[PDB]
Structure 1
């Protein structure tokens, strides 16, 4: 009697969020909630029921304390000795979309469904986005 949502019956709605002056992690938790679909009464673990989210002004996100200088991002090329490192200020200057992708994917589920869910987040540095045709609504989160 407890029913599961039908993928063909799911409706994805478009929202736009401005990140100026907001805290990265506390924004990312809300983004993850809405991307997964925890806010809809038709939530189902195995079905994607989330909403499309567009982040603007991504370069203006903020961190507290000295994390701007101290937070470290690492990657490894599988060659011997290939550990590459960078910090928050340089990364937000260069590829802020990478900052947001790391933050959200670290909270999203790991698997095909999680990979599909993270595709509904669009991040842009400028105040403009190319998705006017979808008529997004302003979301304050």
Structure 2
């Protein structure tokens, strides 16, 4: 069974692992909280699930054009595999890159903090089949829904910038939905 809780920012354990359900949360604010948690607890591991349900505020066309420009115009003229940037598209890798942007750069501390994080789309079967899955929410990073407000999900962004991979992942979800509901 999944038990939902609110993450006490002063009551973070110094050891072990914590799982954060990312649905309904704003990507930048949640990334800021996750980066500070990883920097402040050097021995704690952080798992983020439901990364495709993260929210980016603003117009859908504006966000999609921003991501398209990032994945298309940003390149290199040297050896691309040796020197160029490599831009993620999938929502979990996008969120991990967003956290890497907030972690310290070119340092072993930043590298170790990034390595102590795992991000998943949806909830994995291994996590579901546990006896008691404690999920967390960070209320400060949750979007307050208001009428006439504009926002998009990382899943919608991924579908716009990579329809075939999204189709394969959605089909996999439909294929394993029976076993998921069983677990």
User: How would you bin the TM-score normalised by the shorter chain?
Assistant: 0.5 to 0.7
Match of 2:46 in 1: 53
Give structure 2 stretches of 5+ with no counterpart: 1-13, 139-183
Match of 2:33 among 18, 27, 30: 30
| CA distance in 2: counterparts of 1:139 and 1:59, whole angstroms | 16
CA distance in structure 2 between the aligned counterparts of 1:52 and 1:85, rounded to whole angstroms? 26
Provide the residue aligned with 1:20 in structure 2: 23
Structure 1: which 5+ runs fail to align? Answer: 1-10, 38-47
In the alignment, structure 1 residue 128 sits paired with structure 2 residue 121: no
CA distance in 2, matches of 1:70, 1:57: 24
**TM-score, normalization: structure 1?**
0.65
Matches of 2:28 and 2:92, distance apart in 1: 14
| 1:140 counterpart residue number | 137
Could you report, residue by residue, the CA deviation over 1:59-111 in whole angstroms, capped at 9, with x for unpaired residues?
Answer: 1111111243232324534537998898x9xx3xxx11221111101110111
Change in 2 beyond 3 A, CA 1:121/1:137 = same
Picking from 83, 96, 105, the partner of 2:91 is 96
CA RMSD of aligned residues (A): 3.1
Structure with the higher fraction of residues in helix conformation: 2
Q: 1:118 to 1:62 in 2, by over 3 A?
A: same
Q: 1:105 to 1:136 in 2, by over 3 A?
A: farther
